[PDB]
Amino acid sequence: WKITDEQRQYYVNQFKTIQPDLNGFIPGSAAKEFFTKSKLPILELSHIWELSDFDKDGALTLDEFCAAFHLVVARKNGYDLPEKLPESLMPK
């Protein structure tokens, strides 16, 4: 795993429309749609959100965003990812 500052800007350049800085929160609805817009079906988008939404507040912060976009990119051009998020048995 790794991230390039050059890339982080790429997302913000556009996402800035909704997520300007690490002081922003995107509702799962926006993420679902925004990401869905890319290609991956909402079905998959679920996994991305859960993984990117370490807090599970139904809101994605610039960070959740950064990881989400990056992770999504990989899901599209990388390797198969795991699945720690249990269907109905979250470690809580």
Judged by beta carbon, residue 48 or residue 64, the one nearer Ca ion is 64
Residue count at the site for Ca ion (CB under 5 A)? Answer: 5
Q: Which is nearer to Ca ion, 29 or 77 (CB)?
A: 29
64 labelled ligand-binding = yes
Three-class secondary structure of residue 85 per DSSP: coil
Of 47-66, binders to Ca ion (CB under 5 A) are 53, 55, 57, 59, 64
Q: Can you tell me whether residue 26 is helix, strand or coil?
A: strand
Q: Please say which residue, 23 or 77, places its beta carbon nearer to Ca ion.
A: 23
For residues 39 and 73, is the Cβ–Cβ distance under 8 A?
no
Distance of CA 60 to the CA centre of its chain: 7
63 is known to lie in a ligand binding site = no
* Side-chain-facing half-sphere of 22: CA atoms under 13 Å: 5
Q: Is 55 annotated as a binding residue?
A: yes
